[PDB]
Amino acid sequence: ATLKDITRRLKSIKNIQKITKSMKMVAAAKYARAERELKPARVYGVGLIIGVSSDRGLCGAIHSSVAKQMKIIGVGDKIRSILTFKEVGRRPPTFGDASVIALELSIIFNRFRSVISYKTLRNYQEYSLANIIYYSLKESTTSEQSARMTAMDNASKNASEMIDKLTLTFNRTRQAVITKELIEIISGAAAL
Amino acid sequence: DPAPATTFAHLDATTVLSRAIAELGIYPAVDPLDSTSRIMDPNIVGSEHYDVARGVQKILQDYKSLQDIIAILGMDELSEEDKLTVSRARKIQRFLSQPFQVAEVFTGHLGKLVPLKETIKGFQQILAGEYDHLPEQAFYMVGPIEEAVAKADKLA
Amino acid sequence: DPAPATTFAHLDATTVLSRAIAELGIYPAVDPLDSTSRIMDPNIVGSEHYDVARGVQKILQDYKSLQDIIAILGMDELSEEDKLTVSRARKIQRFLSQPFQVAEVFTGHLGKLVPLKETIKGFQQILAGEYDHLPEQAFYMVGPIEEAVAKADKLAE
Amino acid sequence: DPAPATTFAHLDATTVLSRAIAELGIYPAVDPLDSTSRIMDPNIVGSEHYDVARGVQKILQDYKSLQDIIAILGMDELSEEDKLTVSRARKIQRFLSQPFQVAEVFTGHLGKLVPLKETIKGFQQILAGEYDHLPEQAFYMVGPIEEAVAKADKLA
Amino acid sequence: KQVAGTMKLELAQYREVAAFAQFGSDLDAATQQLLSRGVRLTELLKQGQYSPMAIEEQVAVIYAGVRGYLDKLEPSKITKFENAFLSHVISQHQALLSKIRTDGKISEESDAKLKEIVTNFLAGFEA
């Protein structure tokens, strides 16, 4: 509406654009190392409700996807909050992470397809359990970082479009304000 | 602008058309939150008519307030409760559209005229969550609610 | 506006009030980032008063630049020291509010007057992290810092 | 704004000088994508000039699209077509620079005035991949394409 | 001209990355450094009122920043470091400041002097 409003809306959205862009690039880095790490883990994947995502949001429907399949153990803090293991996601998951979980004890996780897409004896049984937890975790992070990258790329491009639009609105208003003020002066002057 | 601004006080019912709405393909392009009537009153139109109307406007208003977030971050960052008001609001926005006899060349649909009680019923049913399983597009450019169901079935 | 804009240069201290601040229920509605004084100088008020004032202004500006950003991208994306400036700033915003004697008919609270040194000490202690455990509301609409500590207790039950 | 809008009705071209381009050591500091001409049209400058210019613009645009992927995955993770566009784009970026006669004092190097047909030919050959074997820096601060071959030889 | 050019460039590199500072958990080493250098150079551009500086005092301060000596110093301490550092070079190292002014530039000798003043002073400051 007013120049002051527009200026302040523009200030923040220009910030949001840069933040989401940096996030897109951090996620791109994690995903790149995650995909190259998923190859010698998928063939390894060949040999109760457990839910697998992460603590960190802003990765589209990664957390809500598995929670839909959900309704009890949750790996990823976003599972406990929407519906217990914390600090998963920020650092790439190890077999050590899979063992820590199995030691405390169907498994629901996101299977990576592409950047754009993802789909939701007593010593032998102990190993094949940890094997399942690991496979989910390695798939989980590839999907999540790909998704965060896409989400942030989308948010960044949206902000970018909003900036342009508000800038045009700004300049239309700016011109109107100058002209209006000028007409008041001339009308005041000519009436004398 | 002085001319339209001054005109509002001379009217009993205002139908305010919006370019943004027209450009989304919603015709007649009526702003459902900027159009008002002096007889929108439970003692005149009945409580049922009055309540459905206010309930439609509430969800549309609630949807509108969610649109800055949606613009930047999209659907996936909304709570499940918010996604529901969004999906229903979008179905309502579409069910307010209508093929006009006078506009058949532009719509490609046969003109439709809906009796008041059917209009109330249709929006009452959407608000009650009765068609949450149906896709948005089924509600676009139809007449009575039954046509929305048939359109959803034809979309199969 | 030409009228107030032309007035500023005629002043030695300016107290600028804000509708956006009043609207939050923060009274007096002083914009802490648009109020000035010719004597706001370490050589006049002393370095402790100066330092505390600038520290208060710094955390509030830092919070201000974070607002609109975290209102869209969320709180949980903040560092555990960035969100500490948020909690402290929001406590400082409230400790700047104050029940006026003349305003009892509006606040329902008894009027408070706070000596200079007590003001300094209070904002100095918040900035230092001495009250990170107390809730936001404890600092809203009270006199000296001790009243924020007592209120936090009232609020407990 | 009325002032630029009124002026722009009259302009047939823009030369955009850019600080970013200058900090890359490209002189003249002309932005190759930001500068435009109304006569960049096959019906005016010919289909050949047009196809080479458009080929230079495309490759430069394409190279900009890969720069994010370089900062993420590295340059040894590009397809053999994409490796080639980076190689060629960068040589093109450099062959767009040129020493000026008017700067012979401050620089010491001889200025170059390059005929249009040689400009066209030079960039035609880099696009076709005739100089994939030559080093990238040979194309920097040179006149005609032969001088880039001669600079490649001089760089031992 | 020397140090200002380096500072101009490093402040520009900082500005490109600035918004990713308070939202940067998993940044690469390079971008981590651009921020570190930026915040420190920025702190060195802060100045008290009524205390204008001789040009050689200015270059000696900027030197400490552009040569990386303060990169591991906590930013909140920079203004304190500068004030004390400057007091010290003015008092004990008039000859050095003289030479920065006279020689026109910063020589190999002035550079070796400052390296040893700064690193030793800094370790004392953080002691």
UniProtKB/Swiss-Prot annotation, chain A:
PANTHER family: ATP SYNTHASE GAMMA CHAIN (PTHR11693), ATP SYNTHASE SUBUNIT GAMMA, MITOCHONDRIAL (PTHR11693:SF22). Component of the ATP synthase complex composed at least of ATP5F1A/subunit alpha, ATP5F1B/subunit beta, ATP5MC1/subunit c (homooctomer), MT-ATP6/subunit a, MT-ATP8/subunit 8, ATP5ME/subunit e, ATP5MF/subunit f, ATP5MG/subunit g, ATP5MK/subunit k, ATP5MJ/subunit j, ATP5F1C/subunit gamma, ATP5F1D/subunit delta, ATP5F1E/subunit epsilon, ATP5PF/subunit F6, ATP5PB/subunit b, ATP5PD/subunit d, ATP5PO/subunit OSCP. GO terms for molecular function: proton-transporting ATP synthase activity, rotational mechanism. GO terms for cellular component: mitochondrial inner membrane; mitochondrion; proton-transporting ATP synthase complex. It is found in: Mitochondrion inner membrane. The modification N6-acetyllysine is found at residues 14, 30, 71, 86, 119. The gene is ATP5F1C. Keywords: Acetylation, ATP synthesis, CF(1), Hydrogen ion transport, Ion transport, Membrane, Mitochondrion, Mitochondrion inner membrane, Phosphoprotein, Transit peptide, Transport. Its main location: mitochondrion. Belongs to the ATPase gamma chain family. GO terms for biological process: proton motive force-driven ATP synthesis; proton motive force-driven mitochondrial ATP synthesis. Subunit gamma, of the mitochondrial membrane ATP synthase complex (F(1)F(0) ATP synthase or Complex V) that produces ATP from ADP in the presence of a proton gradient across the membrane which is generated by electron transport complexes of the respiratory chain. ATP synthase complex consist of a soluble F(1) head domain - the catalytic core - and a membrane F(1) domain - the membrane proton channel. These two domains are linked by a central stalk rotating inside the F(1) region and a stationary peripheral stalk. This is ATP synthase F(1) complex subunit gamma, mitochondrial. The lineage of its organism: Eukaryota, Metazoa, Chordata, Craniata, Vertebrata.
From Swiss-Prot, chains B, D:
The modification Phosphoserine is found at residues 47, 65. Keywords: Acetylation, ATP synthesis, ATP-binding, CF(1), Glycoprotein, Hydrogen ion transport, Ion transport, Magnesium, Membrane, Metal-binding, Mitochondrion, Mitochondrion inner membrane, Nucleotide-binding, Phosphoprotein, Transit peptide, Translocase, Transport. GO terms for cellular component: mitochondrial inner membrane; mitochondrion; proton-transporting ATP synthase complex. Disulfide bonds: none annotated. The modification N6-succinyllysine is found at residue 154. GO terms for molecular function: ATP binding; ATP hydrolysis activity; proton-transporting ATP synthase activity, rotational mechanism. It comes from the Eukaryota. GO terms for biological process: proton motive force-driven ATP synthesis; proton motive force-driven mitochondrial ATP synthesis. The modification N6-acetyllysine is found at residues 58, 112, 117, 154. Its main location: mitochondrion. It is found in: Mitochondrion inner membrane. Catalytic subunit beta, of the mitochondrial membrane ATP synthase complex (F(1)F(0) ATP synthase or Complex V) that produces ATP from ADP in the presence of a proton gradient across the membrane which is generated by electron transport complexes of the respiratory chain. ATP synthase complex consist of a soluble F(1) head domain - the catalytic core - and a membrane F(1) domain - the membrane proton channel. These two domains are linked by a central stalk rotating inside the F(1) region and a stationary peripheral stalk. Belongs to the ATPase alpha/beta chains family. Homotrimer. Component of the ATP synthase complex composed at least of ATP5F1A/subunit alpha, ATP5F1B/subunit beta, ATP5MC1/subunit c (homooctomer), MT-ATP6/subunit a, MT-ATP8/subunit 8, ATP5ME/subunit e, ATP5MF/subunit f, ATP5MG/subunit g, ATP5MK/subunit k, ATP5MJ/subunit j, ATP5F1C/subunit gamma, ATP5F1D/subunit delta, ATP5F1E/subunit epsilon, ATP5PF/subunit F6, ATP5PB/subunit b, ATP5PD/subunit d, ATP5PO/subunit OSCP. It comes from Bos taurus. The gene is ATP5F1B.
UniProtKB/Swiss-Prot annotation, chain E:
The gene is ATP5F1A. The modification N6-acetyllysine is found at residues 1, 8, 72, 80, 105, 113, 115. GO terms for molecular function: ADP binding; ATP binding; proton-transporting ATP synthase activity, rotational mechanism. Its main location: mitochondrion. The keyword Chaperone does not apply. Acetylated on lysine residues. BLOC1S1 is required for acetylation. ATP binds at residues 47, 49. It comes from Bos taurus (Bovine). It is found in: Mitochondrion inner membrane; Cell membrane. It comes from the Eukaryota. Belongs to the ATPase alpha/beta chains family. This is ATP synthase F(1) complex subunit alpha, mitochondrial. One of its GO terms (biological process) is proton motive force-driven ATP synthesis. The chain holds residues 427 to 553 of 553 of the full protein. The siderophore enterobactin (Ent) produced by enteric bacteria binds Fe(3+) and helps bacteria scavenge iron ions from the environment. As a consequence, the mammalian siderocalin LCN2 plays an important role in defense against bacterial infections by sequestering iron bound to microbial siderophores. LCN2 can also bind iron bound to endogenous or nutrient-derived iron chelators and plays an important role in cellular iron homeostasis. The modification N6-succinyllysine is found at residues 1, 72, 80, 105, 113. Keywords: Acetylation, ATP synthesis, ATP-binding, Cell membrane, CF(1), Glycoprotein, Hydrogen ion transport, Ion transport, Magnesium, Membrane, Metal-binding, Methylation, Mitochondrion, Mitochondrion inner membrane, Nucleotide-binding, Phosphoprotein, Pyrrolidone carboxylic acid, Transit peptide, Transport. Homotrimer. Component of the ATP synthase complex composed at least of ATP5F1A/subunit alpha, ATP5F1B/subunit beta, ATP5MC1/subunit c (homooctomer), MT-ATP6/subunit a, MT-ATP8/subunit 8, ATP5ME/subunit e, ATP5MF/subunit f, ATP5MG/subunit g, ATP5MK/subunit k, ATP5MJ/subunit j, ATP5F1C/subunit gamma, ATP5F1D/subunit delta, ATP5F1E/subunit epsilon, ATP5PF/subunit F6, ATP5PB/subunit b, ATP5PD/subunit d, ATP5PO/subunit OSCP.
